[PDB]
Amino acid sequence: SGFRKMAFPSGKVEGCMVQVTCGTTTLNGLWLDDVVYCPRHVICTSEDMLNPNYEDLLIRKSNHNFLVQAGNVQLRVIGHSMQNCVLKLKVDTANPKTPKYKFVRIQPGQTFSVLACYNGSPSGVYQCAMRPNFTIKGSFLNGSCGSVGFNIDYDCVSFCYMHHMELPTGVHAGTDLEGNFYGPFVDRQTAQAAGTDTTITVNVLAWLYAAVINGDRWFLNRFTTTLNDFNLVAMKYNYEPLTQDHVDILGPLSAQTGIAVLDMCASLKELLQNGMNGRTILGSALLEDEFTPFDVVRQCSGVTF
Amino acid sequence: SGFRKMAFPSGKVEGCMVQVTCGTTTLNGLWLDDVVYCPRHVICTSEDMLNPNYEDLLIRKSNHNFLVQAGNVQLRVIGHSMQNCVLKLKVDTANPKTPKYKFVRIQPGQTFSVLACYNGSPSGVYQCAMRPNFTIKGSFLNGSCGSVGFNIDYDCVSFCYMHHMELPTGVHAGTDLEGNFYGPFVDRQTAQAAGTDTTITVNVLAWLYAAVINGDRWFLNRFTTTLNDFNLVAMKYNYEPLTQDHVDILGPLSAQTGIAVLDMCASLKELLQNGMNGRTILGSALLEDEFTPFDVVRQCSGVTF
Numbered sequence: 230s231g232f233r234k235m236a237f238p239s240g241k242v243e244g245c246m247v248q249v250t251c252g253t254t255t256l257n258g259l260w261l262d263d264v265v266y267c268p269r270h271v272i273c274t275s276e277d278m279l280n281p282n283y284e285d286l287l288i289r290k291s292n293h294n295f296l297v298q299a300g301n302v303q304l305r306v307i308g309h310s311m312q313n314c315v316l317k318l319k320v321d322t323a324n325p326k327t328p329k330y331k332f333v334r335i336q337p338g339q340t341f342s343v344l345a346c347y348n349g350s351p352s353g354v355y356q357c358a359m360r361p362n363f364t365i366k367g368s369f370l371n372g373s374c375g376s377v378g379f380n381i382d383y384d385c386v387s388f389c390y391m392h393h394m395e396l397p398t399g400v401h402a403g404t405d406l407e408g409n410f411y412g413p414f415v416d417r418q419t420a421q422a423a424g425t426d427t428t429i430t431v432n433v434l435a436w437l438y439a440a441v442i443n444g445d446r447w448f449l450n451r452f453t454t455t456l457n458d459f460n461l462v463a464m465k466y467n468y469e470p471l472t473q474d475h476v477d478i479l480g481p482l483s484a485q486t487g488i489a490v491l492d493m494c495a496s497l498k499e500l501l502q503n504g505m506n507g508r509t510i511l512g513s514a515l516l517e518d519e520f521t522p523f524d525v526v527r528q529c530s531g532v533t534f
Numbered sequence: 535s536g537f538r539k540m541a542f543p544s545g546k547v548e549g550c551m552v553q554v555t556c557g558t559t560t561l562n563g564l565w566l567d568d569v570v571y572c573p574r575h576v577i578c579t580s581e582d583m584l585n586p587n588y589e590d591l592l593i594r595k596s597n598h599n600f601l602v603q604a605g606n607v608q609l610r611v612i613g614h615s616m617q618n619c620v621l622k623l624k625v626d627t628a629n630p631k632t633p634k635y636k637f638v639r640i641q642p643g644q645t646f647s648v649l650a651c652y653n654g655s656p657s658g659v660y661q662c663a664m665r666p667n668f669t670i671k672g673s674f675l676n677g678s679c680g681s682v683g684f685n686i687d688y689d690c691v692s693f694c695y696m697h698h699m700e701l702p703t704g705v706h707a708g709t710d711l712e713g714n715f716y717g718p719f720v721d722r723q724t725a726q727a728a729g730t731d732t733t734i735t736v737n738v739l740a741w742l743y744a745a746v747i748n749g750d751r752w753f754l755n756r757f758t759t760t761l762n763d764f765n766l767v768a769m770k771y772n773y774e775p776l777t778q779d780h781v782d783i784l785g786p787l788s789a790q791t792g793i794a795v796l797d798m799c800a801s802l803k804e805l806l807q808n809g810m811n812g813r814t815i816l817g818s819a820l821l822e823d824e825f826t827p828f829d830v831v832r833q834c835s836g837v838t839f
């Protein structure tokens with residue numbers, strides 16, 4: 230028993246991280262097969278970031294201007310191209326540690342692990358969720374760009390995020406591995422403010438199921454509700470609307486615990502209206518929303534990789 | 535910016551995890567050089583755990599009764615011995631992935647990363663602290679015994695914990711890698727209750743420094759205090775006493791932020807007496823105490839491995 234904010238084992242991704250330097254800018258790249266993926270603003274100086282024309286800045290770059298370093302060994306770049314907001318650097322050596330992998334574009338509310346890196350070296354690993362406003366609340370310092378977010382399915386790494394920028398409010402924005410930003414954000418040092426960071430209702434409900442499974446139950450009440458009535462309450466509290474799709478996804482957790490989904494919604498509704506009254510749930514004094522129903526099933530059953 | 539509960543990259547330890555089966559009990563072992571470390575209660579059935587005599591149970595075991603499996607490959611056991619509450623299984627093959635490593639016995643309040651494993655396969659990674667009552671609040675299911683806790687220093691893995699047991703209250707107990715339990719706990723399915731789980735004051739202060747560095751500052755007040763006066767308040771709230779050693783350890787964070795240590799203590803004192811008033815600090819509604827001062831410096835500076 231016990232429930233922790235848990236990231237995937239990072240070894241498979243550690244073996245993919247390299248350093249990319251262009252001029253005086255150094256960040257991280259992802260080395261899969263004979264291609265290194267990195268943010269395209271590696272070609273930018275701090276000056277260029279104010280208003281970059283990436284196509285023009287790229288005319289001035291050749292393969293040999295991209296210094297790729299794997300540990301203590303330099304990689305030979307034999308080609309480069311820009312795809313949306315990432316560069317793909319073709320190298321003459323296939324990464325011998327390439328895992329089985331996929332590129333996936335996740336939806337808001339979905340979770341993933343981040344391997345924070347600096348100069349191509351792994352610094353730490355932590356769990357994140359794509360927020361409803363398409364930011365993530367990560368831990369990134371200057372030099373962490375190119376760090377990736379990922380999920381693992383047994384032996385297949387699904388890369389879903391590459392870090393690119395920090396907004397003035399300290400939240401973070403990035404792309405999928407095809408170089409498309411999540412949300413409306415751009416790799417340009419300008420005014421771009423995040424929208425409302427609503428709470429991921431389906432994840433809160435899954436985490437309440439995790440609590441019940443682990444013995445925290447003071448919050449279970451004598452009530453039930455309906456989707457429409459609950460969402461009226463969820464709206465007032467800046468909670469995402471709960472759909473029947475979400476209800477269906479929570480089915481297995483409902484079956485395991487014998488608590489109907491709408492009953493747990495009624496318990497959540499009271500928690501929102503009454504508050505925690507100084508109590509905690511799984512060691513938290515606020516309702517956690519960065520565990521998916523799949524994360525809960527995974528951690529409560531012992532899935533491995 | 536941003537501050538996350540962050541574990542070390544786990545790859546170096548993933549390459550050390552094996553499966554150990556004795557009779558019908560399967561758990562995890564740690565393969566370093568030509569030795570596999572695992573909990574000695576691998577020799578026990580669920581029946582033996584009620585009152586085991588490990589020396590007697592071991593008379594009935596031979597090298598070939600310990601099945602060690604690394605991925606899909608069996609390892610040949612050429613010797614075994616019991617050291618305190620761990621078994622050391624000598625194998626004829628040195629682990630080719632052995633990292634630079636040390637065995638360390640940590641103190642309460644110190645933090646480490648856990649690689650939760652099942653059947654020798656990594657399941658997830660998360661960050662823990664040795665609680666003042668010598669339990670840890672982990673995420674362990676049946677089969678996770680032998681999972682280890684560790685810190686990394688650049689390239690040297692310091693193993694400090696091996697998981698052995700779950701107490702009736704759902705907290706967890708284990709040993710260092712020499713097989714000595716942390717605290718008074720024993721590998722025996724009996725009545726052993728944890729003492730008071732006090733809050734790690736020095737870690738809370740470090741985490742408040744982390745918050746200031748990241749822009750959360752509403753809690754900074756106009757007050758200061760003394761060690762003695764603060765500890766009078768800390769006692770009432772089941773906070774560990776703050777020592778001058780702790781003050782010294784917080785020195786660097788004090789210097790970086792220009793906030794004297796006793797001033798931050800005065801801010802903490804008001805938070806304890808007044809509460810959070812529904813506010814949050816670094817996305818938490820309670821005071822976090824599983825970041826050490828070293829963890830904060832590490833994450834805020836970008837140390838890598």
Ligand SMILES: O=C(NC1CCNCC1)c1n[nH]cc1NC(=O)c1c(Cl)cccc1Cl
Pocket residue numbers: 336337338339380382429431432478521522523
């Ligand atoms: O999350 C899903 N699959 C996991 C991806 C990572 N590997 C494991 C499978 C998934 N598959 N179909 C729908 C979803 N997810 C959701 O509908 C969802 C949830 Cl559950 C929570 C928050 C937002 C969203 Cl969109």
Ligand SMILES: O=C(NC1CCNCC1)c1n[nH]cc1NC(=O)c1c(Cl)cccc1Cl
Pocket residue numbers: 641642643644685687734736737783826827828
């Ligand atoms: O934590 C320490 N070192 C780290 C070990 C892990 N690798 C990095 C170095 C350390 N070295 N000397 C004293 C300490 N720690 C403490 O005094 C302490 C703190 Cl700081 C917080 C809570 C409890 C305790 Cl005992």
Ligand SMILES: [Cl-]
Pocket residue numbers: 281282283284
């Ligand atoms: Cl452009």
Ligand SMILES: [Cl-]
Pocket residue numbers: 586587588589
């Ligand atoms: Cl004994």
Ligand SMILES: [Cl-]
Pocket residue numbers: 512513514515817818819820
């Ligand atoms: Cl909290």
